[PDB]
Nucleic acid binder design. Structure first.
Lengths: 323, 94, 105, 82, 97, 93, 110, 82, 99
DNA sequence: CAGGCACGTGTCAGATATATACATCCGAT
DNA sequence: ATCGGATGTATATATCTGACACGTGCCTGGAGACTAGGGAGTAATCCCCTTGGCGGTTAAAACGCGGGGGACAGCGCGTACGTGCGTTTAAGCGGTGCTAGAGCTGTCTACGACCAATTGAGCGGCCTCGGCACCGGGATTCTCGAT
DNA sequence: ATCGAGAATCCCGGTGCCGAGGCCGCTCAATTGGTCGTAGACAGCTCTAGCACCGCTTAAACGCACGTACGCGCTGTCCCCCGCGTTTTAACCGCCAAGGGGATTACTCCCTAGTCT
């Protein structure tokens, strides 16, 4: 019940990220925004909000000023600043962050018109991001994402039946929409102690059926690119969506699926439960913990239920993995 | 209350590290504080002067090492350079 | 490790020397490798001074460093006397030295 | 209290003890006046700088730090006072 | 009538004052002299006690060094008795004149 | 490159005092070095005064005190008087 | 706007450049901000010192029957004066020489 | 190369001329070795600082500016050059 | 006599006046340059010296030696003597603080 | 920008320095 | 040899310090893998300035030698400075009382950093003739054995 | 106690020379005109210690007695440094090569910023 308070704090954190280049303030501001957004009360005084962890003196004084005046003088000044607003608008483009936007504003490039007029100053990734600025910012309905998941699974099985592909994230947790696709792939012949062209075959097959439209980067471990659902020859074309494909070894695949399924709060709680149960869980595998904190040989992983049973915790469906 | 600044705790830790069974008086504490401040001021001033001399705009370990070499005499300069290089290597190795 | 001093294995505060390097306006930019080197140099010099003082303190059946002991340690050594040849310490006194000419027959 | 003479307050036994600490054996009768003169000129040289330092800070009390700084300006660095 | 030979008591007091660390100057006359000298530059001044003590220690160090150099010059002049020409020579060589 | 020097100003001052005298290159270099050394000494003393008095700015007071503390006696008196006169003339616009 | 530009040294009635002194003070890392009255005072002090030493050097050169100042004249001017000598006690002038000074004992006793 | 036993290049007439500029009447015969020794000590002390200065800059030619700076470091302040 | 021989001492004051009046180096160039190069060879091998640096070293060394000789003469005059001795230089250096 | 904690400052029991008595010990007359 | 200060020994003050208790502002703060740029290292050449070699002139260094004036050792003396003792006086310690000014804090406000825009002073390049270095001889002055 | 002879220095004049000083064509740092954030000038408070005074206490300072040793003057020995004449000799100037050090480019290669899960 802090829609006005949380929204104004959101852009504040961005400025230390893209302009001031201070992560130590951006992380604190976003943590404060997240903890305030979960609090189901009207906020009346900053001292009352100081009880919540992650809220300090500066946040208190600023929310008090916002409650008193309806705005922040610092925020209002920085809103009308041409340089800061231009940097933020440039950083909205994928591939453009603090250094890139800072340099472009320094050389006069401040609007998307300048980006389109200066193709030579943009690399492949920056040009791809410029081309699909509007498409990338759109959300993906769950039905379209079901369709393209079916298409991806069909193509991957067409490459080889022994492949296993899992679409993790908010979709795996059952959310109605997502901002990107995280595709996780494994191969029985590819383990931690075992081909560099396994991902290449899948990428080439998806490009053949004209599903993947653009390639941002393609390596032996992870691939990032753009995909778009085909239209049925008469309707408007679907907006371009950025899809990420990652190849994981078989002994690490289920742990990677658990890590990328989410959520972040759920992952942190599971890591805390593992730590209090004498285990450490990471993106790759799970290790037992010794009495002195020394990690031993990683345990074999063959299912998510195995991971849950390792830390003596009941298996939870991805829909129940909100926290 | 005016929180005065001193190196007393670090000097005491150093003394316990090399001479575990002895103590030190308050007057000697003040003399050690003044000596540390004077040496720090000398080395920092020489490093800043060298940085201005070489048209640079940044003080790194090179200027500090050269200032130590210029200020401290032979054996002390060599040992201090060895200690500084070892400490820098250990710090960057982490 | 958490603090910068423990990472480099020193006893002097690296961050405090860093703060003084900013405050002392020696240059508008100071690299991160300077304060650890300066702290190591200061710690080594203090260790040598204190060790020589203790080697002079212990001698007189005294287990507490006195400014007289510091003066004896500085003046007796050759390197430290050259380093601090123009420094007079309070309650330091002077080295015992009588010329052979003034000695009795 | 306007003081008239105090250089005579640095008595002959005090000069004798200072000379004995220095390392001399026999002292002539004319050492005392010359020692008083050099003491006076050194004291004026230090005190002028100390008073200038005090006046620049718009103070009327000469602290020990001003004296230490004035001594440092002449190369006679003093430890144990700040 | 046991009277010591001239010099032995000096050879005693020299060791006594070289192994000691006391002030050797009465504090009140030195404080009065400092106040008298300082009043010539600015009237109505007040001194911290630590300032007077620091002045006394600095003056004592300076005078001890001057007497050391004076003794060196006097021994170089084939004598054991210091005379003001020795002090003047030491001050002139040191760069103070 | 464009190396800077007080040569023209030294020559102007020389013609301001002795209209019918010359100066050689070595004497001009010595004068330049003297000017640089005096400037470094005065600026360093002023910076030390600013740091010692917990101030963050060097003003006419700091420069005047540094001049009174470095230059000896009557030279310091004349320098302080003429510097005060110059500051008054400049601030009078 | 844009009135007739005048050098601040001309405003202060000085020959030395107050602007260059200000730039050197700002770039010398002496203080993080420099007041406006410091450069004019410093330039006036430098001008006074140069005028004094140049007047003495010119007097020495005229006494030496030369109309061109050489380092020997500068050394003579510096060492002959009392306050300038103590101000510049620890400096060596290149090709300056040594003032003629012979001890009375070394003179022929006759 | 390998310059060796070259301190003797400072000839006895050169030392005599320097002493005459100093202003001495007559010169003992054992003074030249002492003068050469103190000259060597002073030259080594200055040259070590000059070489250290010309090494921080990562350069192989010793400029006069480094010599002037090294002289200024120990309180000589050579005017003229630079 | 057959030759015109000056008394010992006048041929001192003559050319004392000369070497105090004039400002040349009084030390040969190449021997001093070789000495500087040989001294610097000990610290770092293969080091080049500018001519101006050698000249600056020569000026500084000559000034230092002249000052030391003046102090030595003063000490000799103090010792009721007109001949300078190595112990006089030792005393002057000890008083000056270099030893 | 924010908590964790490393210093700063204040307190008090107490090792360590110092002063005060008597028994040896060594340089002068 | 014996008598005054150094030593040592036991003991009794005493005192300034080092281990706790608590408050408060510094300070150290997501890791990894795939993409680029970019400093660093090597390689390769252009000025070119210092280094090195050969040869000729000659001013300066090296060597010999005859003194003679000063370094230096020994003797005598006289008075200045040491050590010791009685007497005074002023430092030193310990209280009491007062308040001038050091130190801290809140508050505006004038001042200096900073950035477009402008332009005139100072620096690099290029003459050139005049103060000055040098040579030559005559006049002036300094020094020394001789009477 | 000067005087003539021998030698060192000054003065006057003449002659060539190279850099001190002046002029021209620029470049870029000094100057104008504004905005905006904050260092500190200036009042107001506490309250610390610096100053002034007084009263013992006794140890340091001072004046004097008196002895003797050391600073200083004088005298005599001798020795070694200075002045001058003769004999090397390498300092110095002239020329050449020359060769790697400073200053650029050419190419590559690992280090690292970005960037996005």
């Amino acid at each position: 019940l802090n829609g006005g308070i949380t929204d104004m704090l959101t852009e504040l954190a961005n400025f230390e990220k893209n302009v001031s280049q201070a992560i130590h303030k951006y992380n604190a501001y976003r943590k404060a925004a997240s903890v305030i957004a979960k609090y189901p009360h009207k906020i009346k005084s900053g001292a009352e909000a100081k009880k919540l962890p992650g809220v300090g003196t500066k946040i208190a004084e600023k929310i008090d000023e916002f409650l008193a005046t309806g705005k922040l003088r610092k925020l209002e000044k920085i809103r009308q600043d041409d340089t800061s607003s231009s940097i933020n608008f440039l950083t909205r483009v994928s591939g453009i962050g603090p250094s890139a936007a800072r340099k472009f504003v320094d050389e006069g490039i401040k609007t998307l018109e300048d980006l389109r007029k200066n193709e030579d100053k943009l690399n492949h990734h920056q040009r791809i991001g410029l081309k699909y600025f509007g498409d990338f910012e759109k959300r993906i309905p769950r039905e379209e994402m079901l369709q393209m998941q079916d298409i991806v699974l069909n193509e991957v099985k067409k490459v080889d039946s022994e492949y296993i592909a899992t679409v993790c994230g908010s979709f795996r947790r059952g959310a109605e929409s997502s901002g990107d696709m995280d595709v996780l792939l494994t191969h029985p012949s590819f383990t931690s102690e075992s081909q560099p062209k396994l991902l290449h075959q899948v990428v080439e097959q998806l490009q053949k059926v004209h599903f993947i439209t653009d390639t941002l980067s393609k390596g032996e471990t992870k691939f990032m690119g753009v995909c778009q659902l085909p239209s049925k020859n008469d309707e408007k074309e679907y907006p371009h969506r950025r899809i990420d494909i990652r190849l994981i070894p078989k002994d690490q695949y289920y742990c990677g699926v658990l890590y990328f399924t989410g959520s972040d709060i759920f992952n942190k709680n599971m890591r805390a439960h593992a730590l209090e149960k004498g285990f450490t869980i990471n993106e790759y595998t799970i290790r037992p913990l010794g009495v002195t904190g020394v990690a031993g040989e990683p345990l074999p992983v063959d299912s998510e239920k195995d991971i849950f049973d390792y830390i003596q915790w009941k298996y939870r469906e991805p829909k129940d993995r909100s926290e | 209350r005016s929180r005065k600044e001193s190196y007393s705790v670090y000097v005491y830790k150093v003394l316990k590290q090399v001479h575990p069974d002895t103590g030190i008086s308050s007057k000697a504490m003040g003399i050690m504080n003044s000596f540390v401040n004077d040496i720090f001021e000398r080395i920092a001033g020489e490093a800043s002067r060298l940085a201005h001399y070489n048209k640079r705009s940044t003080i790194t370990s090179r200027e500090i090492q050269t200032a130590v070499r210029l200020l401290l005499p032979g054996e002390l300069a060599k040992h201090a350079v060895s200690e500084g290089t070892k400490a820098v290597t250990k710090y960057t190795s982490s | 490790a958490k603090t910068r001093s423990s990472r480099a294995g020193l006893q002097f505060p690296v961050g405090r020397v860093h703060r003084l390097l900013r405050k002392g306006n020696y240059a508008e930019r100071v690299g991160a490798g300077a304060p650890v080197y300066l702290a190591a140099v200061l710690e080594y010099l203090t260790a040598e001074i204190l060790e020589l003082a203790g080697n002079a303190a212990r001698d007189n059946k005294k287990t507490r460093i006195i400014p007289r002991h510091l003066q004896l340690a500085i003046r007796n050594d050759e390197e430290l006397n050259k380093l601090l040849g123009k420094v007079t310490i309070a309650q330091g006194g002077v080295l015992p030295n009588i010329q052979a000419v003034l000695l009795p027959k | 209290k306007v003081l008239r003479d105090n250089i005579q307050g640095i008595t002959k036994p005090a000069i004798r003890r200072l000379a004995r600490r220095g390392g001399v054996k026999r002292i002539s009768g004319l050492i005392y006046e010359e020692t008083r003169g050099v003491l006076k000129v050194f004291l004026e040289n230090v005190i002028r700088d100390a008073v200038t330092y005090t006046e620049h800070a718009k103070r009327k009390t000469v602290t020990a730090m001003d004296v230490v700084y004035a001594l440092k300006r002449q190369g006679r660095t003093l430890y144990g006072f700040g | 009538p046991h009277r010591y030979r001239p010099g032995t008591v000096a050879l005693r007091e020299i060791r006594r004052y070289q192994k000691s660390t006391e002030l050797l100057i009465r504090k009140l006359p030195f404080q009065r002299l400092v106040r008298e000298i300082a009043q010539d530059f600015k009237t109505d001044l007040r001194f911290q006690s630590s300032a007077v003590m620091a002045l006394q220690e600095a003056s004592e160090a300076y005078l001890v060094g001057l007497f050391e150099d004076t003794n060196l010059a006097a021994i170089h002049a084939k004598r054991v008795t210091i005379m003001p020409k020795d002090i003047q020579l030491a001050r002139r060589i040191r760069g103070e004149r």
